[PDB]
Nucleic acid binder design. Structure first.
Ligand SMILES: [Mn+2]
Ligand SMILES: [Mn+2]
Ligand SMILES: [Mn+2]
Ligand code: NA
Ligand code: NA
Ligand code: NA
Length: 318
DNA sequence: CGGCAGTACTG
DNA sequence: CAGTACC
DNA sequence: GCCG
């Protein structure tokens, strides 16, 4: 509806993001989405001010693109931004690493490969640079989840395994697979990793490990046969009591969780991947009270306790 | 003026 | 700890 | 960057 406006703003948002100004990048991001969801084409400064997420400064910017057809600030983005974006698209390298490499004279991934000191994670991200920028067909996400489930249920058939992320939101393609594991007995879930990961690495399924935590694993897998790409895989294990909140957080979207956290704050509660907590004490900064974990056996309970109508995963793709 | 989320890893 | 990543 |  307003792609002539948003396309110019996305350049700025990206530039701010890779340069480290995360809060400005956040503001642009929210305004950009408010633009798409709006009912009609923006046409007035006062109209711009009408929408939540667009303030004076960006009303001006939208006001400028309206008349002349382009943005004055776009012509003054530093020449380093494309290189910073190139570097920060390496998994494990963020804005701080990208800017240091740029300062030290690196300008290409060839420079990085030949002359850069890289962490174990960054070497893996570099090796899979192209693969990790590709989304996968959701039917491939299914094969990966069932691969993990078969290996987990081989140890204990009681284990519950669910792919969340964009997959659970019903999207046709996925950037990764987020697999959540628990057990109804409330104790069978612990210590599962050691045996499960070694099993999945028994297949050649797991190809690289990025993070091997006590509760979270992030790595790389590849299904068998020709024409297969390396895919990002996350495996999270949670106690059954935190299943609902974990289900909700890892299903997303990130903007949806962001909106849920703000709503919770207006009601003196907090919402994390572990629990919905009440009677939280804030000075708007959490201060004189963590609070009590409210019981949430289902995602429906989280919505209910927040006074919201339940939304199934597909309507959370914000 | 200052929050805009917390949580877990890595080294 | 700073940095990065997860939704 | 926005907003209270
Ligand atoms: Mn995901
Ligand atoms: Mn993921
Ligand atoms: Mn590959
Ligand atoms: Na507004
Ligand atoms: Na990165
Ligand atoms: Na050199």
């Amino acid at each position: 509806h307003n792609l002539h406006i948003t396309e110019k703003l996305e350049v700025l948002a990206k530039a701010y993001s890779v340069q480290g100004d995360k809060w400005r990048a956040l503001g642009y991001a929210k305004a950009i989405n408010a633009l798409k969801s709006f009912h009609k084409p923006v046409t007035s400064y006062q109209e711009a001010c009408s929408i939540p997420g667009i303030g004076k400064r960006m009303a001006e910017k939208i006001i400028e693109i309206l008349e002349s057809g382009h943005l004055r600030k776009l012509d003054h983005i530093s020449e380093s931004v494309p290189v910073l974006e190139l570097f920060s698209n390496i998994w494990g390298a963020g804005t701080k690493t990208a800017q240091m490499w740029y300062q030290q004279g690196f300008r290409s991934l060839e420079d990085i490969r030949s002359q850069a000191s890289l962490t174990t994670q960054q070497a893996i991200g570099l090796k899979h640079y192209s693969d990790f920028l590709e989304r996968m067909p959701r039917e491939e996400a299914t094969e990966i989840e069932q691969t993990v489930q078969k290996a987990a249920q081989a140890f204990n058939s009681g284990l519950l395994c669910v792919a969340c992320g964009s997959y659970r939101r019903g999207k046709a393609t996925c950037g990764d697979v987020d697999v959540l594991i628990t057990h109804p007995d409330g104790r069978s879930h612990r210590g599962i990793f050691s045996r499960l990961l070694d099993s999945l690495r028994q297949e050649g399924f797991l190809t690289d490990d990025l993070v091997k935590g006590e509760t979270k694993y992030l790595g790389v897998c590849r299904l068998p046969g020709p024409g297969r790409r390396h895919r990002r895989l996350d495996i999270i294990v949670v106690p059954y009591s935190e299943f609902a909140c974990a289900l909700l957080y890892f299903t997303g979207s990130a903007h949806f969780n962001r909106s849920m956290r703000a709503l919770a704050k207006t009601k003196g509660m907090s919402l994390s991947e572990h629990a919905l907590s009440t009677a939280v004490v804030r000075n708007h900064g959490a201060k004189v009270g963590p609070g009590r974990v409210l019981p949430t056996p289902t995602e429906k309970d989280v919505f209910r306790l927040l006074g919201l109508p339940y939304r199934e995963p597909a309507e959370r793709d914000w």
